[PDB]
C-alpha cells in the first residue's frame, strides 16, 4: 500500500483558520500517508482562544512524541508559526510554495507547516499539504549540519 | 518623513547574496532608513551556515542596537526559525502584502525573511518597503496576544 511509513499529524487552527482546518482535515483523512489526524482545535469561530496558546499545544504533541508533525492555520500563517518556534526542539515555517515546503523538510527538518487562510487559496492549501507529506528529512545531510546549529543554540537555554 | 525612520541590521547567506545587495542599494536611498548595519555574508564564496546570520543580526534587535531586521536566503524559512529562537525576537516568512503588513499590526515582528530563490526582486523590493510603512501599536488588542508569547518564553533561562 504505502512505500512511505504513514505520519501522525495534530492539525490546529484560531478562530480565522476554521473553514480551512476542516476542509484540509477531510482531505488529509483520505490520504494513506496520514495515519492520524489529532484536532487541537478551535472547533469554532466564536471560540476566541489566541494563536499562540494552541500552536504551543499543538507543538507539545510533537515535543512529547504523540505526533510527528503538526498542521496549522490562522489568518497569514504568521503567529501560530512564531509560536510554535518558541517551543524548544520544533521549528516552524509558514510556507505558501511547492519548493518552501519541500525545503522546509529536506533542509530544515521543520515539524510545523502554517497556512494563513486569508492569504492562499484551498486547492493551493491542499496541494501543498498533500506534498508535504512526501518528503522525510535525512538525518545524515549537510542540511543536518545547519539544523545543528540550531539546536547548539537551544542548548544555551533550560526550562525553569 | 511623517514617520520616525528605523535603523536596520540586513544579513543573508551565500545564497541570499545578490538580493541582499539590490534590497540594502534600494533601501539606503529609503528616508525612513536611518541606517543600515549588514552582518553578511558579504560574497557567495562564504559558506558561514544561515543560523550564525540570523542569530547575530537578531540579537542586534536584542541589544536595541537596530529596530528591525531583514534576512535573506533561498527561501526565507532557516533564518526566520533561527531568529524566533532568540528570546523576545519575533521572525516571519512573508511573500505577500498582506501578510507584510499583518506581520508589524498584529505580530510586532521585528524580523522579515524573504527566500531569494522563491521570489522575484521587483516583489522582495515593493515588500520591504511597504514593511517599513507600518508601525506596531502597543496598545492595541494583538499586544496581549504577543504579551501571550512573551510569558511562555519566560519558562526558560539562558545559562550559556
Redesign the interface.
Known amino acids: 500500500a504505502t512505500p512511505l511509513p504513514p505520519l501522525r499529524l495534530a492539525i490546529a487552527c484560531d478562530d480565522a483558520g476554521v473553514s480551512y482546518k476542516e476542509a484540509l482535515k477531510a482531505h488529509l483523512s483520505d490520504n494513506p500517508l496520514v495515519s492520524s489526524i489529532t484536532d487541537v482545535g478551535v472547533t469554532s469561530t466564536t471560540d476566541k482562544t ?4 494552541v500552536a ?1 499545544q499543538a507543538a507539545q504533541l510533537i515535543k512529547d512524541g504523540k505526533v510527528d508533525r503538526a498542521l496549522m492555520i490562522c ?5 501560530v ?3 510554535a ?2 517551543v ?1 526542539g520544533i ?7 511547492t ?2 515546503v519541500e ?2 523538510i529536506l ?2 527538518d ?1 515539524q510545523v507547516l502554517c497556512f ?1 487562510q ?2 492562499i487559496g484551498i486547492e493551493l492549501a491542499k496541494r501543498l499539504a498533500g506534498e508535504w507529506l512526501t518528503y522525510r528529512f535525512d538525518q545524515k545531510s549537510a542540511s543536518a ?2 539544523v545543528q ?2 539546536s547548539d ?8
Open positions: 489566541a494563536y499562540p496558546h504551543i489568518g497569514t500563517g504568521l503567529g508559526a512564531i509560536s518556534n518558541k524548544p521549528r516552524a515555517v509558514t510556507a505558501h510554495d519548493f518552501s525545503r522546509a533542509s530544515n521543520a494563513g486569508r492569504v549540519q545547519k546549529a540550531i543554540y537551544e542548548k544555551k537555554f533550560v526550562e525553569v
